[PDB]
Amino acid sequence: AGWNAYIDNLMADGTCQDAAIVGYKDSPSVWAAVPGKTFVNITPAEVGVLVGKDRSSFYVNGLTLGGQKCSVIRDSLLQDGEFSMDLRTKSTGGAPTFNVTVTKTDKTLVLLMGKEGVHGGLINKKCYEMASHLRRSQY
């Protein structure tokens, strides 16, 4: 229970603008997310591509999250030991882009979006440590 406690901890810092806990087994569904941002609008279809079997279109054509186009920098989502994916939002005309980290647990996908100017490595680190925390409650 209490999936918002993980959202709140993730947000307490101020360095992040969006977070969400999405279950991807059988019928994907967002379990917790920041209201009004963009992860709260992820769809089972997108979740399907994330955990998906076809990963070639990644480095080259990207993917989306809550309808927001993204680019893939690293994908160790299914690879063990890491279980995380690092993306960068896709912007045009010099708009600021953001670092996103997706981390996979036993039952969920933990997603995190940083604010302008926050290193990825920091978004990754916090996402990874939150998924590690969850895997312990076997979730």
Side-chain angles (χ1 to χ4, degrees):
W3 297 107
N4 276 112
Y6 306 95
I7 298 314
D8 296 348
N9 274 277
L10 281 167
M11 294 297 276
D13 224 8
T15 65
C16 287
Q17 55 177 329
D18 207 4
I21 286 161
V22 185
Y24 61 104
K25 285 313 185 72
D26 309 316
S27 34
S29 161
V30 182
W31 298 348
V34 177
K37 322 311 266 58
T38 150
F39 293 151
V40 72
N41 306 318
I42 289 174
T43 60
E46 292 152 349
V47 172
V49 181
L50 279 175
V51 297
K53 64 296 302 167
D54 162 72
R55 327 220 80 195
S56 56
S57 289
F58 294 156
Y59 282 113
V60 277
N61 303 133
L63 66 87
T64 67
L65 304 178
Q68 169 68 56
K69 191 93 189 144
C70 290
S71 209
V72 177
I73 312 299
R74 299 188 191 72
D75 171 45
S76 307
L77 215 268
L78 313 181
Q79 308 186 36
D80 316 66
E82 270 269 44
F83 293 122
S84 67
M85 174 168 332
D86 293 333
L87 308 92
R88 298 203 82 277
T89 65
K90 217 61 154 288
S91 293
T92 56
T97 61
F98 314 101
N99 289 316
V100 185
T101 294
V102 181
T103 294
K104 145 185 287 332
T105 73
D106 329 279
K107 320 198 169 188
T108 62
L109 257 29
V110 187
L111 300 89
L112 191 64
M113 193 186 282
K115 280 171 193 181
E116 187 183 327
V118 178
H119 289 94
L122 178 94
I123 297 300
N124 183 272
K125 185 187 183 80
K126 307 163 94 300
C127 204
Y128 190 80
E129 297 176 7
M130 192 41 85
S132 299
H133 181 92
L134 292 179
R135 274 203 150 84
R136 284 184 42 214
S137 321
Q138 176 52 212
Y139 263 112

